[PDB]
Amino acid sequence: AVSESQLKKMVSKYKYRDLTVRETVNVITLYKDLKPVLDSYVFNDGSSRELMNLTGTIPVPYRGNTYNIPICLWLLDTYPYNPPICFVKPTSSMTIKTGKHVDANGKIYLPYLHEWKHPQSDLLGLIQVMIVVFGDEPPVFSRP
């Protein structure tokens, strides 16, 4: 994976670095296709900041098969006290299936994010929710 020393260096400007690093470790230890990456987040204001996101796939059972659903979770620099900004990340070969929990840009909406409160709310709990919702209604299509 990535080490915690590397994670601590990557999120060095975060307000709650040890908590963010611990939750990230737990996620990438469990979901080995999620990778931590530093990238520029384009805010609504127009400003931009360098934030860590978790990007990759999570395993989702759907009607007799397990699908690798591509996602992106952005951690704000006040993580874990504000929720991540979450997207499904379809490849060039994929479409986004919109619905109650997913808009046309791939942004995800869930009661868990709206209701987010630390420490009862965390990235592992969130991913469990995504696995249930996407298991009911896959947010990405790839064939007719």
Tokens of 57: 């796939």
Instruction: Specify the experimental method.
Output: X-ray
Pairing state between β 65-74 and 95-96: unpaired
Nearest CA-CA partner of 138 in 79, 11, 45, 130: 130
C-alpha of 139 from chain center = 14
**C-alpha to C-alpha distances, 115 to 3, 47, 55, nearest whole angstrom:** 30, 26, 23
The resolution in Å comes to: 2.2
Q: By C-alpha distance, which of 86, 85, 95, 94 is closest to 131?
A: 86
